[model samples]
Target chain A: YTARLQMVKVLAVLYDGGEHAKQVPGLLGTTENELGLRKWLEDQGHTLVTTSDKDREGSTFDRELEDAEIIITTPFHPGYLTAERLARAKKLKLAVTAGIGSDHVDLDAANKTNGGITVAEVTGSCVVSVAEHVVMTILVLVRNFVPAHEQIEAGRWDVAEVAKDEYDLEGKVVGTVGVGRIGERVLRRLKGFDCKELLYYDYQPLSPEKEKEIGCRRVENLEEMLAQCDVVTINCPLHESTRGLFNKDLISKMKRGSWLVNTARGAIVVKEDVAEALRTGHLRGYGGDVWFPQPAPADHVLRTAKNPFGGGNAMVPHMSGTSLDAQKRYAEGVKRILDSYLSGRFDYRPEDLIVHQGKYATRAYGQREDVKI
Target chain B: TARLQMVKVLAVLYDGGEHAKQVPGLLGTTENELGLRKWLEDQGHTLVTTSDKDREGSTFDRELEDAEIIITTPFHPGYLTAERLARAKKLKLAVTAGIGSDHVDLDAANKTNGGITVAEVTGSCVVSVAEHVVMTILVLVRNFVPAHEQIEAGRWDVAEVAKDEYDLEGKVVGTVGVGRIGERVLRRLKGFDCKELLYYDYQPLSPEKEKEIGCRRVENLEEMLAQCDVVTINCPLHESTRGLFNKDLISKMKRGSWLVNTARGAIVVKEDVAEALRTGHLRGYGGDVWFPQPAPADHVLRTAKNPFGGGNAMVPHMSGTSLDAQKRYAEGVKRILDSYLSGRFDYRPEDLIVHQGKYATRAYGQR
Candidate 1:
């Protein structure tokens, strides 16, 4: 006797895929375009529910989560899968992040609910994209390009005013919070600037050979690294160890008049603390593409944060890792992961798998048992 | 017998020097009366500095009548045309306190005052210009200005900004006329891991030098243009190079590419370049050089944009005038002046653009 092929309900929560979204995909690979993932599942007799509404009560995501066997979400428009929500998703067998980073999902809850649903994300999909953004942000802040550009728009050619805050990126010490995939690339890209030194802080240091290859050193203590860096970029994953990591206490330890760039999760830094630091001239600038909440309320502190000179904040939306190039890579990765699951293989790349066989597959979510990279 | 000859040296320079109050001030350069008065007075020479540099009925014209050694800056040039040179009979040496002797007709200068020596503070601020080139490229490539504007306006629309933003990495950047500044630009861009580094010059860079800089030479101008995602103008302004980046040549460049010219404003046709930018042909245009700088507020470049309402990073001609650079060239001016006063004729060979009625460097020969 053959086992029954039960129809699966796949819920996809995404942002409004914009004008002609599918034609050219301003929002790449939404369920409407399906990135081919939707049709593949539908051909297998699976029910697919795609919704842009994911937040708050009685939302489409909540209504669809009741019977969804598989759910897909992007960091851009995350469908927060909390403990309470995970308890409601009785039939959910797998949760997939169509992009990198699954911080929006409660890994602990996903591990404990419904014989432990499997959670996975496309790993290393946009590391280079985010790394490039970090370097750009650092230059924008250091050069005082924002105000300089604004001066041109305002029909002013006040060179002295703009140059008052302008600085060269060369010969400055730059540090990264976590020297992982994205962090390593950021340091490597900055190598051409002739920086005084490149420093990184993480629980585990990079290999001796790798450290020498990049011309960077590993600082064991985060605060020590912060105190020395003229610019600090956050590249670590968001976990219990890193959430609210750059709060007031840690920020105060940083060199005064330094810059901060976070292309990682925004929760790592206390938003208000960063704003205050910029206001009081404790920090020279703050730049990042990440925010605590997606579509960061128009009132997010970082949106208007500025240094004493009315310059030095370069906040953009959470689109750094979702570059058009990156979107294609991550969107394809989503289909591949779905292809395996639909065929009942449940086979996923070790790096991509966050949870499998009712246990954690990566330490990124504070699940240190298996120690997957 | 000399009695420390009291040569009258008149300087015509720009005004409103805020940073010039510092050691390396831009607006307050060595040519400024405020900058060189005390030093010249200590040396027992008459120093006259004025910002009146208009060609017609200006004090600069009056001061030029009997000035023996005139110290002027490109920033505030006293355009010594062939006609003007005819009147300044006592003018023995015309020193450009800064770079670019174009403001003074080199041909007229070479023919006047028994073939007067025309020189500028050469290589005084190559690093500053090179740094600005890299910064402008980054600013344009990253679509930084518009992104920053959206934030200041209290908006957080990511897609609108990201659609235009791009990474400089893996893009082919070419420099037209790879001279000193061009060579350094190639070296600076090496760190970006761009797809390829291309240079177009009348003469090719040495293979060893090219290899060291990790750049390839594109022998033909248009050939290099077609391949470049960004082209920076680093050549000098001469007959052949002037208006080099006109409409026809600009059309040959890759669509949606960028142009950064720190070389000279006239190297490009102002109206043509502006129209090109207004269309979607060129992605962006950034440089600190302009044709008749302190560009009239109504200059087309001040408002030119594509349908997207973006793509211009035009600023005042201040890249070479940075505070750090001002300190250097200002000091260089004093050295040049001292050398002239001492009758040593021993000038930094490269600093002299035209001497004894002949071109000092092939780079500036009559094209």
Candidate 2:
């Protein structure tokens, strides 16, 4: 029984006992609750155990990971698996994610010690959700809705007071750092705003039809796009290619008093650089539902976070995927992928699978053979 | 001979902005100082100021006593309760600074000592409110609240949200009691090219009027709500309409349809409408007026049925009378006062006095 059924159980410890994984529950919650995995997994006799505590000494992960074949983690608040720990678990099979991007586990180590520990995530869980949010935030920070609402609550009716800082969303040039599923959506929706033009810097170009339909043009590089855009949305996944991406040097190139929305990953941009950008008015505001670690520490910088006196830093718990309705979609999607895998049938839609045997695969993760341009 | 007797007049209105500084023969009082003094002495005419429309003993009522004419506005209506009208023995005429004189007690107006005349500048801001109704309708139909809420919450609800939202293209729009506002609502709705526009007006429009806006006349309000993807209230607020849009009427609406009200706030039964919102029977609800303006903090509709679990994109009574609209109405107000002062009341025919030492016509908007 042990040998034949040694497929794997992906440890989705999306939270610590007391530590939350920020807004990852938005999707993980669905993966755990909404996705009909309990029935499906038991059908194949493959167990799916989810926990909010991965860091406890003898916590759920500690007891669960011993015989568990695969370990799945998320970035909002990750359960990092150092390479040394991988040597102890001899039967580790495959690690799968419930949402896009796999930055939680050590990638280079996965290819070595427990060298065959394959890692994958449910690749497009909420692209449409994040894209629309980026467009909405840029307009919000640019138009100064918060402070204006603040004025209303304080019982003040000064039009010039708000109008001075308030600019229309209609005239701005919106930019995207890495144009992917979410990035393209931001631009497509911005097409309705009648922005002068939308631009992005991506290695590959979208088809002419989509480019025309979304009213966007490609910038030669990130710096050019940053320099020209009035509002820049961060849509790139977290990776070595993007870590510390928005450092001081790159931020300086952005037009002063410009806006930024990062629904992507917070680690993609330098945290201190963002706070500094807001303080100096180099960035008009910083708005995104993401923080570096989920259930971020009180001092985690952006949480009771304010930028200068007024017009910067619009932050909240990551809730893009948690919309009561979205929870329904992603929850069922994850279960489907797991059902196929445990039954010795990887009937995953081509775009859905990221890792299969001993290699990274999804096109989003730079695996190209299966992906068409 | 008429010019010899300087029968003073008092004009009360909100700050109408730049153009009023040039209004001829009309002494304008800023909304704050509507006490009917200094300016009245200067122009040999009366000028009263007060945003205080409710206090029967306040300057608004005091000035009403002797002035040959009194002016007020729909945006900030002075509720002349029945008791206040009975005490005003010498008041000869009453004017709504703008449209909709529902604030005035018309029964007492018809029975004024010798009976007083009440007139308003009809059609002044009808187009503005109608256009705003269309904007609010589209805003709700497209589920614009969560789209906008996403910005402030700093999260997006696109796919799940947009799945339910739609363009106003093929919507069936019904306006309950479409008079001036309703007819205009139909005209502007043509731009959205709605699948059909229906209105239930007491005085049904001529076939020509119906043809102009591509709308049909409906006999029953319930049938209209059942047929509409969107329903708007363009009728006046009165006894019959205090709770016209009650829970049962809302349930009769097609599930998940949107509703807009830019008329008086009292027309909707607030808590019931809010409950309907929580149940998702109504996709969203929005408007400017509250049953009582300056709605209480816990006013249900204030944050009633926001899409993203947030506040409705409700502004404070600013839609109907934009600064641009205020200019026109404020000028029209002064003109009404000037004509009354010298006994040259050349008010628009249909927009004339209900009582003047004689019989009363349908003045305070008969339903």
Candidate 3:
């Protein structure tokens, strides 16, 4: 077989390995491990370029992708592969998403170039991690924890200032916008909260049997569900039909002063609309781990979104899915996909393949007529 | 009905802004001159409220000298020792607007003013405190406080914040004492898929109840602590439990573990807890109670942490005093006062701290 000597330029984009990661040595997302992927790739004769800084234009990532055969990127530290960039990668054949969400890449264009290069991701790798983060964000906003903690650090004890807005999640209506694996898990986890009701809105309803297990009822219309919820979490995939779904008009339909969480995707929300809602007190809190064009500039409106009371916006980098454990799982999944491609099998988990052989493998981005499998 | 006594009543509670007044019917402010005044006067009794009760030669001293019935809150206790109890010759009843009566010395209270009858609103805010316990544990376990702090400062160094962050799952979490609040904390934590749940209490919970919650009982506090990645304090403050989580006990905890104390400020030694945090012997400390209510600005815990940063999620002692809970306990306090005035002695059995010069609840330093 000719495979033993075959090697390709494989590039990986991740985040810095910080002090705690160095101390623990198990944080796989570190530059050192490249999600524990580099050494194995080297042993297999693939040249690997590992980096934590490559989001900017004309950066190392842009320069390297010119001839790279395979590129691995994470949702946390994305290597935005646009149609223009994909057109320049003359030899690029495979685009592997080290974690969930291939929105960072131009999925449609990955199909149009280089005899339809394959695009796949590690599904379910960070579903639990994202689910847990949603719960934490909800609590952080509901309890007014950020301000309360700040008050302590400032050596102030003005309970009224914080307590006036602090509320219990119990007996409050909460809804999830999508009921996929992450959404279902969010509902199941919130079961113990004694919420007044749990609701979900999705294009398709869950099986009655599964619905019963989670004790959540499906709301056929999105606006109807929004009006009733004290807290709404967006968990659907980012796609043409779903992107910008939570803009001004839809946000206005939500209960006044309600909290919203979007760990799904940044583009799903209109950043300005959410910021305006927070300023006007129409929304109590706006939180999530997703942002449009991440490595979001410091001056991005959402970075400082807050109400008149000076609290309620809890934003973090796109890290909800890159926990140490999730990194290990997704990193291994990436290696497996790479193995299959190198061995000429092209066999990958059907669910993980976003595009294969010049067409969408899944309808995650809605119906496509430009290409066929 | 023995002549409904129109006696003088005094309520000592926290002083803050308008919501306490905007929702007086619900807030039951338990403070001087407003929340209790409007209601007590309608019932035809004299009322006085003094937030200035702590210092000597203050308005509280003058008020206490002549007060017949006193209402106080753990949020702002009036510290009635033997001296104050003896001075208030007309005092015959003491009502706590919320839980915990540690400010008043029980032994001294037993001897003075023909044995004052002390009662509180028990089971009134168990859910509130329990909810707070879960919230604080998450704030510590997830390293949430620091992350949020960074965000508000217009910073988004994800790696800087995320390096120390962790998920709450697969970590052994234990509660030091499992009473009503403790049990409820476990119930809420059940959905998180923790690696193990453990509890230590002087009085063991029923086997069936323990099994129902999927929690194990560790008879020894130290044994329970050694296995926990996070530990919460839920027992009442008493002589035996006072300073129970001192440096010696803290030393037994696993290195870099978290500690949450919402029980009572005195249950843990503040200096030791702070020092433990500074040395990283304890990774974090989440507490809302302080040895002195309205914790003085210089309290070591206010700024204590290792040089590496991160440790301390202290807040005002407001866990058991949420606005929703304020309404519940306030109504209970008014009921307690009514029973004493009507001479019906209709206090809920669970709330009686001392009845007719004898101990009632085992929580208050009683065996």
Candidate 4:
């Protein structure tokens, strides 16, 4: 306990907010705000270094990681911790994701590094934000909002041009790839729209009571569910079994001209496959915030992919989980997690731990024969 | 009641020749003609459909001289002014293929001959417009347009977008004139867990209905506006509501509150709205309805932006004209025409705006 109480070096990699952050004090996830932890850590005789530079070698993050005992990052602007990077971070003991997803941390490598460097995230902080985004993206694509809005900004008003692609979400079969917290909420929000049916495909089906309450059904087969859905949303995690799950073959099973929304992770779907589908009009739309790499290269195909009618791409930077309200929740959650680690109690909420004690603590990453702690 | 020996029906719809050919589901366009030609022609009634309604000596005005019934859409309205109504002495019925009969002068409709029946396809597009209202609110609150714009512009600046972005949760949302569409919007928002839902309407919902929806009724509109972070207009457009959201009334609203109006464009003063967005008094303004359906290229709302160069989410008036909505409204129009042609005059009470020299619905001022 005394050793844990000793002053430790903490490094945080966050996105640069620049003037935008100065205008909004609620942007706690920005590098300028540093999860609002600078003064708190410094008062405890702990050294805190926050930077936006994470990708380049010998950058501020790399230099600070050499001796840092704790590192905090966010899904919005991830600080990737590969096996090679972890091998060099000899003093690192804890990695905290201020946001929900922790795929950027390489959970498998984290489980083996230095007797399992504890990896935790703010579990429920982004559920509502991301779910709302999923619903919004679905409407944006189905309604052909982007191109219609583009027509207005371009000083044109062609209702027919947009109306040809616009559609009502009602009477459409909506399916979710994984029915987790966010996916369940998405179904709940859509219940009022009078969609023809709500469906989910997951390894574990929800209880009969919960299923009846949500008015949704779970399909036993993924491809079977895809064929019946008019709109498919990806809400599964990024792991071995799920990554590239929606490649060309699976997407081909989807209803022709149906829309696809992926708020889970960009890697879950083959981007080129999706772009090609959109180009050939097999899929009417492809939308979501996730992209393969943060700061998706300026030429990412999904960013500009359009259907045959020249509308139906609703791509945005990864921003669903970083709204101002979400930022506050994740920021406070990070402080709580740090408090537990600093006090040596290590009583983290079980749901927040992705890896612990040199073993996989949660099954979300995927099932493997790693055994128990 | 006597069946009319022969009648003329004129429909003013938008031109969608190529698009309608591609999507024959566009039943509201002139090229598609509501699929009513055979139904009317087989019954010995003449059906004339055209898109030329605005030019001088247009076909609409020329045909209205002897046209017994006129059908038009909110998307491409055939404006029936007081003078036009006077000229249309034989006009006995004016059918709005979609919702919102604001283009027809209700005052004149009541006095023309023995009060020409002004009706619309009620509930035909209520769900469509209500869905659009919620989508627009989320679009504006979540700061979606600018973020998507970044992707289209080949940039990814999360901070630039997230700085203005906010979650819909925990915000006070209110609706003005909560009728069919407003109530639907509130019901859809119920799952989002808003802080509170307030509505201003002349008639209060039943106690049980209010409790079921979990909404409060504010007697005063300004009081409701001052407390809401997002205010949506769902009231009908009538004489009393023509310019309801002018600068003075808009000033009473909370600063930086977003507004969504799929009701009608004239509800808010166009210039005042643009100014508020420019000055950051209003955070955002969004909806599909515009003052003029084919708004000129220079329409201020088309390019209005908040101080941060975001917040304008305008689009062509297509919210209530989705293909699904078109099918519903087309059927509704046929139903109304069938009743009129059969000499039954049994129109749905909810569908009539003006009937027999009086207002059929209280949606307009006075019973």
Q: What share of the true interface contacts does each candidate keep?
A: 0.30, 0.00, 0.39, 0.75
Per residue, candidate 3 scores C-alpha lDDT tens digits across A1-373 of 5344378888888777667667756567767767777778788777999877786667888898899988898888788989989999998999998888898898878879898989989888888878888887887788777777778778787766676677778778999988887898888778877788999988657899988877899998999999999999999888788888899999999988799999999999999999999999999899888888777777788878897688888887777787656767887898889888877777788888888888888755664565334
- lDDT for each candidate structure: 0.79, 0.63, 0.81, 0.90
TM-score against truth, every candidate: 0.89, 0.62, 0.94, 0.98
Of 2 and 4, the candidate ranking higher by lDDT: 4
Ranking by lDDT: 4, 3, 1, 2
- The model with the greater DockQ, 2 or 4, is 4
Which stretches in model 4 have alpha-carbon errors above 4 Å?
A1-4, A369-373
lDDT of 2 by residue, A15-63 (tens): 3312122323333342234244566556655666776566657767667
Instruction: Score residue B326 of candidate 2 by CA lDDT.
Output: 46
Per-candidate RMSD vs. true structure?
3.6, 9.1, 2.5, 1.3
What DockQ does model 3 achieve?
A: 0.49
**Weakest 10 consecutive residues of candidate 1 chain A by summed lDDT:** A17-26
**DockQ of candidates 1 onward, in order?**
0.39, 0.07, 0.49, 0.82
Can you write out model 4's per-residue Cα lDDT over B1-367, one digit (the tens) per residue? 7776678999999888699999998889988889999989888899999888888999998998889999999998899999899999789999999998999999889999899999999999988888898899999999999999899999988999998899999999999978889989888888888999999999777888789888999999999999999999999888889899999999998888899999999999999999889889999999998887788889999999999888988889998999899999999999999889999998999999999998889887645
TM-score top scorer: 4
RMSD of 4: 1.3
Candidate with maximal lDDT = 4
Tell me the tens digit of each residue's lDDT in model 4 across A1-373: 3445679889999999999999998888988888889899999899889998998868888888878899998888889898988988999899999999899888888888888899999998999999999999999888889889989999997788888888999899999988888989999888889999999998856789989988999999999999999999998889889888889999999999999999999999999999999999999999999988886889999989899988989888999899999999999999999998998889899888888888887766665677453
Candidate 1 lDDT over residue span A255-311, tens digit each: 888999999999999999999999998998999788888767777889888898888
> Candidate 1, residues B1-367: lDDT per residue as tens digits?
1333788998877764554453234434433452567788887889878777774788888989999888877655678778888999888889886688887787888789778888888887676677778878877776666766676676765556556666677799999877778887887788677899999887679999888879998878999999999999998877788898999999999988999988898999989888888888998998877777556667777667755667787766666666556667788888888778877777999899888987887777334
By DockQ, who's the top model here?
A: 4
